[PDB]
Amino acid sequence: LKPKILTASRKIKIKAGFTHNLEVDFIGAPDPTATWTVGDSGAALAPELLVDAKSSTTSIFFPSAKRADSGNYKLKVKNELGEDEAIFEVIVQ
């Protein structure tokens, strides 16, 4: 079952020293693989916030978001031969 990621994916206006709740969804299986990256063509995100993910979906946290968090949260999921991806430009104010 290829991953059908429908998460709108666009941007994320978070504030500094704030908490965000990133959400996403994708029908991938069996047991697909979703990676939460941060643009940069190789950069990733997680240790600068919280992150969660499910086989047919995924969502990550930003309870510790700050000006630095200002990055391009790019997530890419897959599943054997099915592949999907959602771009999330996250900024902080």
Side-chain angles (χ1 to χ4, degrees), residues 15-19 63-67 92:
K15 288 246 265 235
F18 269 42
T19 62
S64 240
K66 271 165 49 152
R67 177 205 233 157
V92 198

Side-chain angles (χ1 to χ4, degrees), residues 50-79:
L50 264 176
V51 181
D52 302 72
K54 261 182 187 171
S55 328
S56 327
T57 192
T58 193
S59 45
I60 79 183
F61 263 52
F62 298 60
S64 240
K66 271 165 49 152
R67 177 205 233 157
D69 261 43
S70 77
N72 281 5
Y73 279 43
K74 220 219 253 258
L75 158 129
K76 278 195 300 154
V77 327
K78 25 193 297 203
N79 197 116

